[PDB]
Symmetry: D2
Subunit: 256 residues, 4 copies
Amino acid sequence: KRLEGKSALITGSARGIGRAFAEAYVREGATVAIADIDIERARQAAAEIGPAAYAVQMDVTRQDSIDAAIAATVEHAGGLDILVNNAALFDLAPIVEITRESYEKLFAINVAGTLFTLQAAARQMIAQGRGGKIINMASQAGRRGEALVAIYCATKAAVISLTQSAGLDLIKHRINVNAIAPGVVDGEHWDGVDALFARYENRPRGEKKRLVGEAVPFGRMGTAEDLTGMAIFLASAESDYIVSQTYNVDGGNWMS
Amino acid sequence: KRLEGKSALITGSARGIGRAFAEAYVREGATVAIADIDIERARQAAAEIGPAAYAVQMDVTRQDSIDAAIAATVEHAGGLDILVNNAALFDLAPIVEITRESYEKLFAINVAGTLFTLQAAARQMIAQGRGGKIINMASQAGRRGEALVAIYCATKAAVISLTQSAGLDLIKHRINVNAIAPGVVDGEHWDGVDALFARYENRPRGEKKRLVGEAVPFGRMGTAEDLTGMAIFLASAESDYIVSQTYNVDGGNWMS
Amino acid sequence: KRLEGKSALITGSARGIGRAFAEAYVREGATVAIADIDIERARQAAAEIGPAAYAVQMDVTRQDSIDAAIAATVEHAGGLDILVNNAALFDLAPIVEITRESYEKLFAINVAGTLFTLQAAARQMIAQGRGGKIINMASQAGRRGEALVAIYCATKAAVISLTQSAGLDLIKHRINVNAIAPGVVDGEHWDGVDALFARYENRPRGEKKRLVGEAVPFGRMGTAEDLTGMAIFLASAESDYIVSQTYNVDGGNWMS
Amino acid sequence: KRLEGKSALITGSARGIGRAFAEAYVREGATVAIADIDIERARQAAAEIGPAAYAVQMDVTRQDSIDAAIAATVEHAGGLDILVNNAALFDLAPIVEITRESYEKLFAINVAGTLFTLQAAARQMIAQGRGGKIINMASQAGRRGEALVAIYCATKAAVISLTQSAGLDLIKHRINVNAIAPGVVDGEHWDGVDALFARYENRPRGEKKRLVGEAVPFGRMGTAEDLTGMAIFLASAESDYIVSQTYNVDGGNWMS
Ligand code: NA
Ligand code: NA
Ligand code: NA
Ligand code: NA
């Protein structure tokens, strides 16, 4: 068990990628705060995962909620050792149709949410004096722009950048900051994602997803489970010398 | 010469780099909107440059000011062919001292200001149906993070991403979107920049600036004139096949 | 006349892109050594271009030919101010079919040829004490690997790398070293290239070429003329502060 | 545990980084071929490591030696599952002093050695039908050039490129190709590396090594043990969806 006795918090972990990370972390001996805007779903998730997972209501766009979430983790587990910034929102629209609402919402959650949660965790970790681990969720989208995905790509580029900056600033406190960049990951969101491409590219529903899946060198779209090995690795002692990096786990969909 | 008959608008061009760009564009035969929030200096600059330059009041953080600026180029110049997003703000603080005010202010101007001005320009260019040129100002800060400069770095990373996405979306309208990434450029702003570094790096005043200058492979910090050639090139016919690129003009300070 | 009074040498300029550069340089006032293994065609080209162009026999794989070529520009033009390393060979094969012959031949021309010509030009430029410009030809292939193009991609990656190293080492002598990276350029060679892809991807003849052209965001494969502006720019005073860069001119085919 | 029953071959594994990888692999349950040009050193390393390690004489510059080594692996273990291309040579010299001997020797070992060993391993893995893992050793040097290290940097850039190309071509055979890029790693070679820098930079002995060590954000130069976690990870099932990536493990010395 590579994370034995560790205290983690994962934002947006009631469902999806964050939820898989939560389960993997518990398997590896960690206690995990299931942080989510949906307290009901967080409580269900925590009960399904087991005794070591516990629900925390959190809105990463609000400072008071961020601070309350950190304090609940300290209260419940005695401190905080691992942060995963997984909360994210996707959207899509061509340049001439980008709205200020899309820009503000996606930046508030994907960039500000990650930045200020990272900062609150950093402060707690510094106060503890024991290190150690922060993992941001980037994306292939942050590696290169895309015609219909300007806002989301830009938030993920910002995340990769913040990962580098925070990494350099916090390593003196024995805190590693790194990021994982998935490529295309299958899941409940892809119906809406495909529908959005179908609308703007004028394709039959389902065609975009299929083309995307067929283009991954590996042979298929990713699963959350493809990513858990890396999430454990970057939270363990085996990654202590790894600083300010973004690692693509994407079946070859992007090369860095 | 190279920009004969072209209508341009440059944000933040009352002073510094933007003004040097405006003066260079006029020498190359363009008509130029000196768009700045400092309308008094924009007017003095427009008056000094000559009849081909005219002052436009603009605050890239306000949608109505953005739309009014584009309307102004239509009124004065009959339309818009070249947009340079030059307006920007700098700040510096370690992760644990980053404020929401700093985040919101730098993103509103550096990211939202660039995105929505680009969008307004693109709409006008598409309506004209004669293609166009858009040049965003990035920075070495956009290429890699820095311990003390998380916010500014992230905004410039977002600009590089947006440059990429917009370039891919808009090329079918014959609009080139690219960016210039300067390195370190000398100017009065370095008193404050040095002071901020001196404080957090525990150095005597002037030392940071000195060291930064000495470390540029070319052998000196940049001037506006180092950048003017590239600004003309990316607005000229010689750059027609150039799409979604960021070009470093930085004395070798960063290699891309 | 941005290259007035300058002396240049361009490798592999009897035909194609290199010849287009030579013609462009001549129009900008330069004297140009048409250097090529195909001396017959180089002579014909120099005669067609006009009195400022002269043929020079060179095989970039042979040190004695390189040194004699540099000596030729000194003799005919009085010195050497601009070098363009354009000579290159292409090949294609899946990993399990790559031969040592293909490896040796592509590295000798593409990498050794560029490196040691660069070296010989640099020595002459340092001896002159007037600085200089060196432009290497990279490729999109140099920016990212490709299943069937391992050898060529690796040579172009080596070129980008060498451009960076040489740029850092030579700038103290006022020599700018940079590179241009074209995307896909139409031409006679595409019949063979298409044929090779057709074989390994199991495609009808001409399909690969068609798909490639349609996949370029700009909407067409490149021409030599798309590249001439950048070639002049990087040899001119407008690029003095530009060091160790590789610039993509590729219709958006790769974003750097 | 993590590599139970796997057959590995690591080039240059008698001493240094390869040796550490060999020892870590054996602890994780692998059988390891200790390939080295120095057969007595290989036979000795194998003896010391244990019964799961066996010596193989190999010159990665010779096709026949490469082919013989793979065959011995198939002879001793029942086949080959993991290849680590660790054999490498370093050299240093400014542009004007680079010799053809330095160019040829470093490229033969660092590039050709890696390419043709990877090719022979791939062929054997394809014939087995059970997939496989291949890890190339890159370097921070492959990420960006340096004034005094053009040859070595260029070889490591070529390695990163080959990693991408081979990864894309071989994943259909269920062979993962990835690379590790250490930053600066302490070891017996650094006394000579420092000496080379001291010579050309004209420094007291030891000054370069200290400055380099002090500039790593983490706080010290690397050890081989910093890298073993990643070497195991990329050879294990936890990296199955990881293709064509180069991962920096370098204390923050370079960010990718
Ligand atoms: Na629970
Ligand atoms: Na005026
Ligand atoms: Na002639
Ligand atoms: Na043994």
